[PDB]
Amino acid sequence: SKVGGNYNYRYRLFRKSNLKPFERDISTEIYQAGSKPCNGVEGFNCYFP
Amino acid sequence: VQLVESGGGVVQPGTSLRLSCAASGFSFSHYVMYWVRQAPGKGLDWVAIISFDGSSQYYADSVKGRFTISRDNSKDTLYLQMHSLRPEDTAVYYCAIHGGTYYYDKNILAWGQGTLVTVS
Amino acid sequence: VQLVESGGGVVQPGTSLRLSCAASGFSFSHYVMYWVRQAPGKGLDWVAIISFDGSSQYYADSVKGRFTISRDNSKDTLYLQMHSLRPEDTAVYYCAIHGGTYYYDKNILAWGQGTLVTVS
Amino acid sequence: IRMTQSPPTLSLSPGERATLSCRASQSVTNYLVWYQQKPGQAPRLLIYDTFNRATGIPARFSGSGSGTDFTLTISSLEPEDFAVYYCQQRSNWPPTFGQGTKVDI
Amino acid sequence: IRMTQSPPTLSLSPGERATLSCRASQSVTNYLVWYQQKPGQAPRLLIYDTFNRATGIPARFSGSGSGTDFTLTISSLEPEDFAVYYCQQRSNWPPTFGQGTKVDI
Ligand SMILES: *[C@@H]1O[C@H](CO)[C@@H](O)[C@H](O)[C@H]1NC(C)=O
Numbered sequence: 001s002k003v004g005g006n007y008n009y010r011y012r013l014f015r016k017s018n019l020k021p022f023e024r025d026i027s028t029e030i031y032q033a034g035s036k037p038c039n040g041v042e043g044f045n046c047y048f049p
Numbered sequence: 050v051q052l053v054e055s056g057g058g059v060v061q062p063g064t065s066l067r068l069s070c071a072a073s074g075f076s077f078s079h080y081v082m083y084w085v086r087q088a089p090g091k092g093l094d095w096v097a098i099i100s101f102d103g104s105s106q107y108y109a110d111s112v113k114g115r116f117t118i119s120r121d122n123s124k125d126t127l128y129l130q131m132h133s134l135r136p137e138d139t140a141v142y143y144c145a146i147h148g149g150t151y152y153y154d155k156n157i158l159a160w161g162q163g164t165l166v167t168v169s
Numbered sequence: 170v171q172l173v174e175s176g177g178g179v180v181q182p183g184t185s186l187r188l189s190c191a192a193s194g195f196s197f198s199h200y201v202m203y204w205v206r207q208a209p210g211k212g213l214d215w216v217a218i219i220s221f222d223g224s225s226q227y228y229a230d231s232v233k234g235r236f237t238i239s240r241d242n243s244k245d246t247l248y249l250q251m252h253s254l255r256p257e258d259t260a261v262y263y264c265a266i267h268g269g270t271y272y273y274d275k276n277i278l279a280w281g282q283g284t285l286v287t288v289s
Numbered sequence: 290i291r292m293t294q295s296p297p298t299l300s301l302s303p304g305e306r307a308t309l310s311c312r313a314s315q316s317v318t319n320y321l322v323w324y325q326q327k328p329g330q331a332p333r334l335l336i337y338d339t340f341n342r343a344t345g346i347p348a349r350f351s352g353s354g355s356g357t358d359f360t361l362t363i364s365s366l367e368p369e370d371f372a373v374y375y376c377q378q379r380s381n382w383p384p385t386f387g388q389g390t391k392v393d394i
Numbered sequence: 395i396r397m398t399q400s401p402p403t404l405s406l407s408p409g410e411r412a413t414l415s416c417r418a419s420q421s422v423t424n425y426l427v428w429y430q431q432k433p434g435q436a437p438r439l440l441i442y443d444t445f446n447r448a449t450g451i452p453a454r455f456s457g458s459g460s461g462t463d464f465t466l467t468i469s470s471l472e473p474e475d476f477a478v479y480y481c482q483q484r485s486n487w488p489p490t491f492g493q494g495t496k497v498d499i
Contacts, residue, residue: 003105043446043456083383093324093332093375093386107382143331147379158322158379162331203488213429213437213480213491227487263436267484278427278484282436 014049050074052161054144059167062136066166068129070144078102078122079154081147084129086140096142097129101150112138136168170194172281174264179287182256186286188249190264198222198242199274201267204249206260216262217249221270232258256288290314292376292387299392303368309361309390311376316357323352323361324375324386332375336361395419397481397492404497408473414466414495416481421462428457428466429480429491437480441466 014031030040031047038046056068070082084096097118098107106118117130127144141163148156176188190202204216217238218227226238237250247264261283268276291314301307311321323335336342336352339359354360359376373389396419406412416426428440441447441457444464459465464481478494 001105003107041453045446085386092373092389095383095385098383109383147382147384158334158337160331160334205491212478212494215488215490218488229488267487267489278439278442280436280439 012049014047050157050159052144052146052159054142054161054164057142057164057166059169060134061169063133065130065132066134068131068142068164068166070127070161072125072127072144075157075159077120077125079150081150082120082127083145083147084118085143085145086138087143088138088140098147099127131166134168139167141165170277170279172264172266172279174262174281174284177262177284177286179289180254181289183253185250185252186254188251188262188284188286190247190281192245192247192264195277195279197240197245199270201270202240202247203265203267204238205263205265206258207263208258208260218267219247251286254288259287261285290317290378290381290385292378292385294374294376294388294390296390298390300394301392302394304365306365307363307392309374311354311359311361311387313357313359313378317378317380318355320378320380321352321359322377322379324377325370325372326375326389327372395422395483395486395490397483397490399479399481399493399495401495403495405499406497407499409470411470412468412497414479416459416464416466416492418462418464418483422483422485423460425483425485426457426464427482427484429482430475430477431480431494432477 019025028048030038031049032038033045036044038044040046051072051074053071054069055071056066058066060066078101081098081100083098085093086096087093096109096112097116099118099120100106102122103119108116115132115134117132118128119130120127129142143161143163145160146158148158171192171194173191174189175191176186178186180186198221201218201220203218205213206216207213216229216232217236219238219240220226222242223239228236235252235254237252238248239250240247249262263281263283265280266278268278293312294310295312296310299307319339321339322337324332325335326332334343335346335350339352339354342350342352349364349366351362351364353362361374363370371392371394373391375386375389377384377386398417399415400417401415404412424444426444427442429437430440431437439448440451440455444457444459447455447457454469454471456467456469458467466479468475476497476499478496480491480494482489482491
């Protein structure tokens with residue numbers, strides 16, 4: 001902990017399906033929301049998850 | 050555990066004063082310390098905190114900007130460095146221990162015995 | 170969307186002026202509109218609001234009592250009705266859209282292009 | 290996150306039992322400590338972390354309570370244990386002490 | 395509920411990046427919109443609701459920030475995009491515009 005913040009510690013907040021036990025994913029890409037093709041833009045409901 | 054504080058007396062409104070807190074017994078590093086004032090005829094209220102090395106110091110109201118707390122475990126003491134004071138924070142001051150940094154740190158708490166500062 | 174405003178010119182300090190805002194494109198009902206002035210050489214600041222039919226009009230400072238904003242969706246326009254003016258609110262005026270009334274209203278915003286009023 | 294001690298001064302004789310309540314502005318768990326300050330002394334701590342008192346404090350001092358409401362109980366102290374009492378939290382930064390409750394006779 | 399834009403005029407060349415901050419007197423979430431007003435034109439809007447810019451605004455314009463502190467960033471605009479900028483809220487009534495920040499060279 002640090003005053004002003006300590007931001008080393010991220011976490012996935014958005015994914016596709018339910019992850020199975022005891023594997024991981026470091027596939028840092030865009031996130032896609034709906035029926036729009038964003039696929040690596042942002043702003044209009046795209047993300048970094 | 051033991052705590053001995055020093056740097057009390059009478060000053061003028063607009064001088065400085067070395068507020069020092071010496072610790073022994075328990076290991077002075079791995080441990081979070083802080084200060085607490087009490088104006089005579091009041092309750093209890095805190096001053097400033099330091100986190101086991103100088104990377105993060107939090108402050109209270111109306112003492113931010115006149116108070117620079119620093120610790121140094123290579124000479125195992127604590128400082129407030131009251132600086133350019135007011136004629137209204139005449140009080141008694143105590144250095145106390147918040148406690149704990151790792152999992153094996155066995156949190157115990159202890160207090161000093163007071164340091165009196167007065168103004169003119 | 171489109172917005173066209175009209176009713177600018179030169180007046181005297183103590184006359185009236187029809188400030189009208191015509192809208193098309195998007196449906197003029199189901200949508201909250203308002204006005205915003207700018208004195209030339211200043212920033213931006215608002216005037217008055219109307220809520221999709223006349224039931225609730227909010228006003229700003231020093232324009233309450235000289236300004237009667239009204240909308241009428243059966244002829245799809247907007248009015249300020251500047252009335253008994255001052256020689257200090259010479260400015261440019263814009264009608265803009267706050268947005269949204271129901272859940273299906275897909276909030277989009279748009280601005281006019283200005284109407285200039287001057288005093289003597 | 291501000292502490293408060295709502296019972297004011299009391300007049301319990303050397304006997305009987307006393308029960309003192311401390312609240313909190315939000316959820317604090319097993320993080321309080323009690324202090325007993327005489328007229329003009331250092332505030333001596335009483336209770337580690339809502340349940341176990343420290344060394345040199347007898348068994349008649351007990352500390353309990355949970356959630357956001359905490360309680361210190363004197364079973365049958367003695368003919369002196371009249372001072373002011375404080376509740377302090379060590380959840381986060383920093384440790385707020387509250388208001389305080391005296392006792393008289 | 396009054397907006398404010400605390401960075402004053404800046405002198406960033408056609409290149410480099412610029413970062414502009416807008417506060418609020420209380421909690422406003424995803425309700426701000428950015429305007430870029432040239433000398434003597436209509437104030438053209440930039441960004442829907444803190445995250446997506448409207449049509450006809452390129453990708454070098456980005457808008458972010460949260461809580462009560464919001465930020466507009468120019469990555470590498472061009473050799474013209476120097477005007478005044480405004481932040482407006484649509485939380486309640488009515489939409490306050492703040493102060494404004496010019497840019498020079
Ligand atoms: C092996 O590759 C898969 C790819 O589907 C990955 O999910 C998995 O985590 C990898 N194994 C380990 C031990 O990380």
